Design a protein around this ligand. Structure first.
Ligand SMILES: Nc1ncnc2c1ncn2[C@@H]1O[C@H](COP(=O)(O)O)[C@@H](OP(=O)(O)O)[C@H]1O
Ligand SMILES: CC(C)NC[C@@H]1CCc2cc(CO)c([N+](=O)[O-])cc2N1
Length: 246
């Protein structure tokens, strides 16, 4: 088992649906932030170490390659933060792996990002997200790793995360650089709604017979999850309300 597909798309661009789609195609696990949050919170400090390594004057690329290889052992693919921020390193480690860039309208993306992943620090909803996350054992260590991974993706040290104009241009910039760095024959750009056919051709497989392309992880559902985590204080007690999410 080795990485076949490197997902370079940013959070809220359909990465969880792509994760599920790749697991359907290959019948092997794909990495995603949900793997960290719901299955392996122990990985948070490992990711934090790697991102930190990138902030050294002279970063040790072999330390990073080895960390990545450790983290992704047994996975056939990667999507979402924090792995997407390392797509260049992943490309080097796995020269035969193809690259996917999931993408969507930037304004739709920002609204989705604000409601689920990166609320403004002035948003009361941020406190609700944090309360719900405590139920899952998710705390400041997680938030620091995820924010750091985003800043690493965007290649910014000091950045005002609360500024929508900065995020919007960072988003466009990120997507543009992926297209300029990855050779076109090694890259598929997948827009929301594109479904199986460009993906499957790209990966040299048939369209899965009678299996629909996944449509997962909407902001409405994530808002509901937060609301129910706060209300019932137990993931196990509410997971029947969220089929196919985790
Ligand atoms: N097959 C599909 N078609 C359209 N939108 C999809 C989709 N799969 C996922 N999405 C959208 O992708 C976003 C989540 O992406 P990610 O998994 O990276 O967090 C959500 O957007 P919204 O929050 O606007 O509803 C979700 O609704
Ligand atoms: C469990 C949920 C109710 N609260 C956790 C939230 C939503 C899921 C999530 C997903 C990502 C990337 O998909 C990131 N991220 O990259 O910062 C952060 C978070 N945080």
């Amino acid at each position: 088992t080795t990485i076949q597909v490197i997902g370079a798309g940013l959070p809220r661009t359909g990465t969880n649906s792509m994760k599920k789609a790749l697991e359907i195609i290959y019948s092997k696990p794909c990495y995603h932030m949900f793997e960290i949050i719901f299955k392996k919170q122990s990985d948070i400090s490992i990711w934090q170490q790697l991102i930190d390594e990138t902030h050294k004057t002279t970063s040790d690329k072999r330390k990073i390659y080895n960390g990545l290889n450790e983290l992704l052992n047994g996975y056939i693919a990667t999507t979402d933060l924090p792995s997407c921020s390392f797509y260049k390193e992943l490309m080097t480690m796995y020269p035969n792996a193809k690259v996917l860039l999931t993408i969507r309208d930037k304004y739709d993306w920002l609204y989705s990002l604000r409601k689920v992943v990166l609320p403004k620090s002035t948003d009361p909803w941020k406190l609700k997200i944090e309360e719900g996350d405590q139920v899952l054992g998710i705390d400041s260590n997680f938030y620091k790793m995820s924010e750091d991974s985003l800043k690493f993706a965007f290649q910014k040290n000091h950045i005002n995360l609360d500024d929508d104009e900065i995020l919007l241009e960072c988003y466009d910039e990120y997507n543009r650089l992926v297209q300029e760095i990855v050779p076109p024959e090694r890259l598929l750009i997948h827009h929301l709604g594109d479904g199986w056919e460009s993906l499957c051709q790209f990966l040299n497989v048939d369209i899965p017979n009678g299996i629909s392309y996944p449509c997962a992880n909407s902001h409405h559902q994530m808002t509901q999850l937060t609301e129910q985590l706060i209300k019932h204080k137990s993931l196990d007690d509410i997971i029947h309300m969220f089929p196919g999410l985790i």
